Amino acid sequence: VSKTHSFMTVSLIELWERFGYYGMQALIVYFMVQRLGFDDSRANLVWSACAALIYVSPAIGGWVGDKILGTKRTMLLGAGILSVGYALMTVPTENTWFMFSALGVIVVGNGLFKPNAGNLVRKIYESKIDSAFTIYYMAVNVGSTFSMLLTPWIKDYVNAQYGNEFGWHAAFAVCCVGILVGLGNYALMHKSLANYGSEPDTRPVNKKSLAIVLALAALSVVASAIILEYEDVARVFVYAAGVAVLGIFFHLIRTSERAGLIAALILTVQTVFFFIFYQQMSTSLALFALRNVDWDFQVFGTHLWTWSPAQFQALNPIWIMVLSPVLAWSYSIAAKFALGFAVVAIGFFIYGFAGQFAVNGKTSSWVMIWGYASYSLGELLVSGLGLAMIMGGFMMGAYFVASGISQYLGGVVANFASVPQDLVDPLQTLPVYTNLFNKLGVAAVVCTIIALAVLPLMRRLT
Amino acid sequence: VSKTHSFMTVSLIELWERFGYYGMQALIVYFMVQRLGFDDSRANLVWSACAALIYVSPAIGGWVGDKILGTKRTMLLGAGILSVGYALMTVPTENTWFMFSALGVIVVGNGLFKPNAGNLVRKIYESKIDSAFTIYYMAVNVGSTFSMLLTPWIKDYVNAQYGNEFGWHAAFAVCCVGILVGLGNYALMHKSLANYGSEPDTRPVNKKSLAIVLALAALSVVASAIILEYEDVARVFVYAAGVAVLGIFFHLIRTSERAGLIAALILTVQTVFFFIFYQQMSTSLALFALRNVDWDFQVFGTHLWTWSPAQFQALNPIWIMVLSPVLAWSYSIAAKFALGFAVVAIGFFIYGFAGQFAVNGKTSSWVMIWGYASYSLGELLVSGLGLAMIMGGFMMGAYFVASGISQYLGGVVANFASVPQDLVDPLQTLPVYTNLFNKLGVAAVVCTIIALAVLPLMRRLT
Amino acid sequence: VSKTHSFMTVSLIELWERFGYYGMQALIVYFMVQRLGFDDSRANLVWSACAALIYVSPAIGGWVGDKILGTKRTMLLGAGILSVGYALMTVPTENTWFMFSALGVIVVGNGLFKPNAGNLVRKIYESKIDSAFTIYYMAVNVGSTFSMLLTPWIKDYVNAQYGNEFGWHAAFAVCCVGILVGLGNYALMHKSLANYGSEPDTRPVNKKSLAIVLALAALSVVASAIILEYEDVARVFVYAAGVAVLGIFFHLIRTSERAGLIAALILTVQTVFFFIFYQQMSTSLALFALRNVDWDFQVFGTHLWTWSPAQFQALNPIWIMVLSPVLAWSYSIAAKFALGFAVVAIGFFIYGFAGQFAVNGKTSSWVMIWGYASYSLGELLVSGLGLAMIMGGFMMGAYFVASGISQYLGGVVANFASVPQDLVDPLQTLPVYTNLFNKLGVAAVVCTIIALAVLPLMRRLT
Amino acid sequence: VSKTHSFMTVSLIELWERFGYYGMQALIVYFMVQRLGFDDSRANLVWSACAALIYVSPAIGGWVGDKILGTKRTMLLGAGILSVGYALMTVPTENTWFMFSALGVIVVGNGLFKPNAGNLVRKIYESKIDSAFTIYYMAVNVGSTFSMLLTPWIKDYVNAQYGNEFGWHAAFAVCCVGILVGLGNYALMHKSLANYGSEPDTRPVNKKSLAIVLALAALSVVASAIILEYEDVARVFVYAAGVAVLGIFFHLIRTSERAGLIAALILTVQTVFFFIFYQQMSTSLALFALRNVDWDFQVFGTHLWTWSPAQFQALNPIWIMVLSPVLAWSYSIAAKFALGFAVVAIGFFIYGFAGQFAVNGKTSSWVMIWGYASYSLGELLVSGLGLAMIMGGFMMGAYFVASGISQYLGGVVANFASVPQDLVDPLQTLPVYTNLFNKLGVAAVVCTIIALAVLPLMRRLT
């Protein structure tokens, strides 16, 4: 019908997938701490290790879709696997080895879906791909906004009326049917994308490669599950991946009139610094909002609604949609890496500033409003950190793993604010959060000083 | 003599008509609540239903003036009817069916005057019509400024010296003689406009069409009066008009390479949101200033004057004249719909912020100064909402009725802050106003988020 | 030698003349109130009547210098007369008729000096006259800065060491020798200006015209003296001048395609409004600083110096020199008349804001610092009000007298804050100043609204 | 190899030299007051007299390197002498005549190193010398940042673990090995600079000139040492140098169409004003941070680290690196001399503002953060004051000595806040610092008024 209509199909299946995922991520940390018996120091590492596997997962699935299998049907393979994942979350048990299987299925499902969905978005428009993606991302933000608001409300509602289990699991069931809605939506308008495939979707399926990847995918689920439960398995894995990145960089030092890549090393170091700050938003800030934030939302002394601690994470997509047009009007260069560090700093200082003026053991919820406004602003102007990163094949891969490991590294930083489960009084848990965030803000000021001091080197490469 | 001299005549008769009208609107809500025995929940609906009939009234009179009758003599017909309306208000009785006849006469009189007066202003300058109207509007603002200051003072003065009735009715008598002054002013300088008429004013009067419209006008007065008193008659009327707009839109969906009109639907939705916020200024804010605002105006601890609650509405034309040149210097695009929502939000938050810092049961009057500064600023940059709205005949009409119905809808929103007449203590009526305004400000923040999130769709139509 | 050297001579004699004058004006109001037995309501009218005669005095002397006598030797005649004036102030008596003779001599001396000094400055550069005057004015500001700091210190010093009289009179003696220094400075470098005269200085002196003006000058001194003491003589004089301006305007109405002069009438009305606000700075603000300002100047809790109430007026030339380059950098149109009204408003609100936060009966002296910063800023961007004012001969004269009368009118406005000399407690005199200034600030806000509302008329003349 | 590689060598030896020096300057005032028995009024004059000899020292060494000796080997001669200086500081005695020998060796060593190091930086790039120096200065700021943080920590650490002496002396030993590191770093990459020398380094060494300068250098060390201990010897020296500058200026008055140099005199006067304010940062601010600043650094109520009073001076290089790119983005003229005065003023007012809100006898350390942000900002936009200063040979020299003397003059201004060593209570020493800084801020406001009032003269030379 039109290229917009093919863009309509992929944006609809993309909207409903990020719906299911972010509706699950907002509750996955609370689910381990509250519903399951996980202490927070373990729930931080288990999620962060999963967030590391999730981030590097599109590297394989992006290659499987266009070199081996089909970018459409590999994207659909990822979607079907993701259906299983959230369906695996909705069965009501207290089995640990049951939830880790779902998270590993989510990791394998994510790698096969996300890059391929965004890959053919680039193929649909052959250079207004920038106009399409900017509408493609606003569809992501508007979709994840609903789920992060909807799914924690279902969790609160069904638990109040139906007992103890169905609340958390209907929330996950909502994420599962979200995937099925987008799959059904794609099944009806698939005709436009059927004529717009990758290079091998034109050609029929290779069952040798199909059986190989399906066996490796099941192998990967089990390999990802083991990594999550046994924390030390992930440590050595993170260590092994960390030494590899340090090796690819030194091997690149012994090469070439090519001083400009020592700046790429500096851009990688600050990237490791950045993901530790953003990973903090899903770990400590969720626990901070869980224990020491007054969910009662009152504007100038009148009650509106009582928050759910997972719905605070919906303020990230909201603030992205509110600030992206404002930055566009600001039109009428890796130094902006330093500017993002400064924004992240005052965001950690907001939570610190929250401790002084508002004291009841619980700081107000308005902190989560002004806080997430800062982190999302910081995220807005810097994210896509290594997309513009510039014989470069192992260089891009080193950037990937360094960003994946820092996801896990952000989890061990959040453990600095891991409350012992023998500390229940919120008056006593307030210092452990404000102390972490305050020096985290100081550390972000140091990164600002670092990136600003290193600026004469960046201007010298140009 | 000159085109400016023909513009001088129409601007003088326009200045004196908006003088009579706004001098009556500032007191019409108080007149029903104070002088008459109307509870506020009824005075809100009766005025809002009248403000709905007033807004859509120029649709007929604008067509009667240039297609059937004469834009000059239809404008003059409206003016003469408006003379009767304010004269019908000045007779001192406690009869309900007596005031509703005046309001209906005002509705019929308004439709015949306002569009035709502004119609020939466009005809006088054949493209500096933008230069004329900008002077034509400043004449409106300076005229309605006097009456909204003058007429409530007469109401206070004559009531203090002459008892109980003459105060309110001399205020309306002032609005009536205001119309007669402009009619007398037009009767002397009519020679310039006599040579500048519509298409049929050239031709003599058609008494068949004259008698038909005069009978329909009297029919319309009675039809408008019945709608006001019996609130349910207006509800079904508003319902019937609401279903019609929903029908014209769907009938337009089944038509056409014409996706751009789904944005016109979005522009209509936010317009319904907008008029509910501005209708709030005449309903709840007048009652808020009536019961819970300290009329004592003191600047840094010295008494100046004591306000009349109706004179606060004169701050809207004043702030329009103060801010329109400032915005002009700001020169050295339906996203400004979102910007207006943000301004309206902080305006409702001013009244909310008023509740905390200033507490005696009565908030200060400076709230009405900074408040109306915000609403008028918001109004300044967005109003004329659907003038630039773009086979389009039923589309423009759907925009009209959707904006008229929202006038009545703003009245039912004001009823959320309808004080029971058994609640006299201002300390107890302060929460009912601050609670409405505060969440109204939150609702305007949501509209800001909506219009900003929908911005990639508006940029895609261009 | 050079045109700069001829500009050096006139700027040096100009610097020393404004030295003597402003060194006398800063103390003339205090001298009548403190040293003499004048109640403030009389000292306000007597000075304001003199400030009116001073302002319109250059009209005659500017014409005497180039049409009748010699712009150089008329300027020198004014200077010699001004020598007598400050010498007439230095003789220690308590005779009223003795000081009024000096003030009248100052009025006659001022009219003969000021325009002629600035006249040949225009002649020296034949179009960089704008570059010369901008240096010519900075010489005025730096000269009047010294005297307004120096002369009140001499008054305080000599009174403490020598008794009661010599303090005030040595201060005036300092102003007299200031004139003599500039006369001596001119007597040495007169060779450059001797070749740069007016049209008749080339020609020899006409003793018929010389004797006529010298007799009229003595006649004018006595006529000016009588006007000052007997207040009613000035009232009828001000009335007679007021009716004349109202007559010249109506006589101009009966003339001419010349609607643009009704804006000149509006520019005159706001000018009358402006001079009332600036005349307030010399009248009420001097009395406010005299009675209710803590002369103790301490910055963050450490004593620097103790002010003299007359030295606060030196903050006007200081702030002029500080803000004129800032406005120049602001480069990278009678609406600025409205902007000046807004600045004057917040200046009167500073003194009002001073009343609340600082209360001991005496407000801090920092008010005089931030206050004079506002008035001088306001003065900076609007002053020279009718220099750009555009068969125009009686029109310019009407602008002159309307600005002169408003000087006296500003004196009667200051009388609204005239303290009875039976009210000594500063706690009781604080309201009478804060009440005047606060509503004066409200009146300046009205002028802002007026000039902004009238802005569509000004844009229509262009 | 490349011009960058020759720039790499000089920037590495420069980084390590400013490392040793600023690591010594941060502790030299405290060393005299704390470790030695010097009262602060003497430690201020002794350092300021040394800072005067240090500033004018590059005048000889800059001429010795290119006219007599070799810019490379004269720079290396200075470096070797500077090695001796910090080695002379590391031997643990209480002998006064022992430390003064080191400071004099530092003065002779500094003059021979600093200009020659920066001289050939200009020679390496023959016009991107501005691009090299901007990277050359960032290497200076990053190097002095480490030492000013590192050396006071060694002083605190070794004193706590090893007693009383080794702390201060290992800190100086760290500065000595810093010089040796850069000398060793230069000894390895000397091949690139060996081909890039001055005019006579090409030619072999002249042992007549070598022996003469080495004897004069030893003579200069003893001459500099005597000047430091005996304060009156420096006074007459400063007097003799002061009369010389007043003589060179008058001798230049009797010369020449050359009025523009009376502005150079004005630029010199404000320069004397400037160096007194910046010299204050090393004298009084170090003592203020020593006695009346809470070294406990807590952000929003959580302890980070406890400061060392010498490490506050590391905030100057840090803020330079943070603000220099911000000023570069401000791109999208000796009036900026006035702007720097205004910045310095609010910096002295920060310390004054510190006295009111924070009172325990000790003001917070955040004052040192916001304070040094102002002084460094002021320094950023004005420093290099007389580099652009424009038969001019004695004119440049007069500018040098006037800037050197003001270093000593800043020391006598700091003595206005010299606490008697019989005043130990910090509650009693707080006024003596806040009183100095507050009126120092007032004096900087006067310099702002002066430079702004003199601005019409500067615009007239262009």
Side-chain angles (χ1 to χ4, degrees), chain C residues 4 7 125 131 134-135 138 297 299-305 318 321-322 325-326, chain D residues 349-350 352-353 356 434-435 438-439 442 448-449 452-457 459-460:
Chain C
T4 300
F7 176 78
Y125 285 94
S131 167
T134 47
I135 302 177
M138 292 292 284
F297 186 33
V299 285
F300 284 123
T302 146
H303 202 287
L304 305 185
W305 59 78
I318 292 170
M321 297 177 298
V322 171
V326 164
Chain D
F349 287 130
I350 289 175
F353 195 14
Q356 159 66 11
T434 61
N435 290 14
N438 272 319
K439 52 191 54 181
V442 177
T448 303
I449 300 176
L452 283 183
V454 82
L455 217 41
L457 199 284
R459 192 183 175 270
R460 118 179 306 263

Side-chain angles (χ1 to χ4, degrees), chain A residues 4 7 125 131 134-135 138 297 299-305 318 321-322 325-326, chain B residues 349-350 352-353 356 434-435 438-439 442 448-449 452-457 459-460:
Chain A
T4 300
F7 176 78
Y125 285 94
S131 167
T134 47
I135 302 177
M138 292 292 284
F297 186 33
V299 285
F300 284 123
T302 146
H303 202 287
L304 305 185
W305 59 78
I318 292 170
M321 297 177 298
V322 171
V326 164
Chain B
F349 287 130
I350 289 175
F353 195 14
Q356 159 66 11
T434 61
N435 290 14
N438 272 319
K439 52 191 54 181
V442 177
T448 303
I449 300 176
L452 283 183
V454 82
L455 217 41
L457 199 284
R459 192 183 175 270
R460 118 179 306 263

Side-chain angles (χ1 to χ4, degrees), chain B residues 278 315-316 319-320 322-324 326-327 336 339-340 342-344 346 370-383:
Chain B
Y278 290 146
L315 301 181
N316 171 263
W319 272 115
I320 290 307
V322 171
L323 302 186
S324 52
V326 164
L327 268 295
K336 313 310 151 66
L339 178 50
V343 180
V344 169
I346 69 184
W370 301 121
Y372 269 67
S374 175
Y375 296 82
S376 60
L377 170 66
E379 164 187 349
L380 188 56
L381 81 149
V382 308
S383 191

Side-chain angles (χ1 to χ4, degrees), chain D residues 236-255:
Chain D
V236 181
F237 200 106
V238 165
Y239 274 115
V243 184
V245 179
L246 297 171
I248 296 183
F249 269 144
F250 173 76
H251 167 223
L252 270 165
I253 291 175
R254 290 174 296 110
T255 292

Side-chain angles (χ1 to χ4, degrees), chain A residues 37-165 167-190 193-194 196-198 200-204 206-255 259-328 333-362 364-370:
Chain A
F38 284 60
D39 75 86
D40 55 355
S41 74
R42 185 189 184 192
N44 295 341
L45 286 194
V46 171
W47 167 245
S48 306
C50 183
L53 283 171
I54 289 175
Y55 180 83
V56 302
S57 196
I60 292 294
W63 161 74
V64 168
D66 49 1
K67 276 279 188 172
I68 280 192
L69 259 174
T71 296
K72 266 152 47 198
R73 44 205 192 93
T74 303
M75 195 226 305
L76 291 169
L77 175 56
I81 294 181
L82 290 180
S83 316
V84 174
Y86 311 140
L88 214 54
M89 288 281 194
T90 196
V91 28
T93 67
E94 295 86 334
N95 196 340
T96 53
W97 172 248
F98 218 37
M99 176 198 72
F100 296 109
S101 303
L103 287 170
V105 162
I106 291 170
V107 172
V108 172
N110 194 320
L112 293 182
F113 175 89
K114 231 313 175 185
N116 293 308
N119 241 337
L120 50 79
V121 172
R122 209 158 173 165
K123 270 76 174 182
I124 292 178
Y125 285 94
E126 303 154 339
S127 179
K128 69 192 78 171
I129 62 178
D130 311 325
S131 167
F133 269 92
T134 47
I135 302 177
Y136 182 79
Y137 289 122
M138 292 292 284
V140 175
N141 292 318
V142 72
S144 60
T145 300
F146 295 153
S147 57
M148 279 183 157
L149 295 174
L150 186 68
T151 59
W153 179 86
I154 272 82
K155 187 221 73 58
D156 287 329
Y157 176 82
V158 187
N159 263 337
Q161 290 274 23
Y162 291 74
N164 71 296
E165 314 222 291
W168 295 88
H169 297 280
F172 295 138
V174 165
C175 300
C176 185
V177 306
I179 299 288
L180 302 177
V181 167
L183 284 179
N185 218 8
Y186 174 94
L188 301 183
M189 300 168 294
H190 85 299
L193 281 191
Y196 262 105
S198 174
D201 313 34
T202 300
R203 345 220 227 94
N206 189 312
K207 288 227 180 67
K208 304 196 302 288
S209 302
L210 187 66
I212 284 180
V213 300
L214 287 180
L216 282 177
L219 186 73
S220 311
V221 171
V222 180
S224 294
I226 301 175
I227 291 175
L228 295 185
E229 335 149 50
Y230 303 133
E231 296 174 323
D232 196 287
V233 171
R235 305 191 204 272
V236 181
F237 200 106
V238 165
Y239 274 115
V243 184
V245 179
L246 297 171
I248 296 183
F249 269 144
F250 173 76
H251 167 223
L252 270 165
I253 291 175
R254 290 174 296 110
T255 292
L261 284 202
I262 203 177
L265 169 71
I266 293 302
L267 282 175
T268 296
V269 165
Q270 310 178 214
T271 299
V272 179
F273 283 143
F274 260 121
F275 275 114
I276 294 177
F277 293 148
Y278 290 146
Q279 174 66 14
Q280 278 315 308
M281 109 176 180
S282 310
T283 2
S284 58
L285 298 195
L287 302 179
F288 170 72
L290 176 59
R291 316 197 218 190
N292 287 178
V293 158
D294 187 7
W295 303 344
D296 192 311
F297 186 33
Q298 52 186 228
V299 285
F300 284 123
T302 146
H303 202 287
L304 305 185
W305 59 78
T306 54
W307 281 106
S308 172
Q311 291 170 328
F312 287 119
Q313 300 182 19
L315 301 181
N316 171 263
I318 292 170
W319 272 115
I320 290 307
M321 297 177 298
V322 171
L323 302 186
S324 52
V326 164
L327 268 295
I333 204 159
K336 313 310 151 66
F337 230 38
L339 178 50
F341 273 140
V343 180
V344 169
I346 69 184
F348 279 116
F349 287 130
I350 289 175
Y351 296 99
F353 195 14
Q356 159 66 11
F357 260 46
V359 186
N360 323 117
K362 296 173 297 180
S364 168
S365 69
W366 275 95
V367 194
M368 303 296 297
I369 293 185
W370 301 121

Side-chain angles (χ1 to χ4, degrees), chain D residues 428-452:
Chain D
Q428 306 156 1
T429 66
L430 188 55
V432 317
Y433 289 137
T434 61
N435 290 14
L436 172 68
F437 305 149
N438 272 319
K439 52 191 54 181
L440 280 183
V442 177
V445 178
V446 179
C447 305
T448 303
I449 300 176
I450 289 171
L452 283 183

Side-chain angles (χ1 to χ4, degrees), chain B residues 118-137:
Chain B
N119 241 337
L120 50 79
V121 172
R122 209 158 173 165
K123 270 76 174 182
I124 292 178
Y125 285 94
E126 303 154 339
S127 179
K128 69 192 78 171
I129 62 178
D130 311 325
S131 167
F133 269 92
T134 47
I135 302 177
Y136 182 79
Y137 289 122

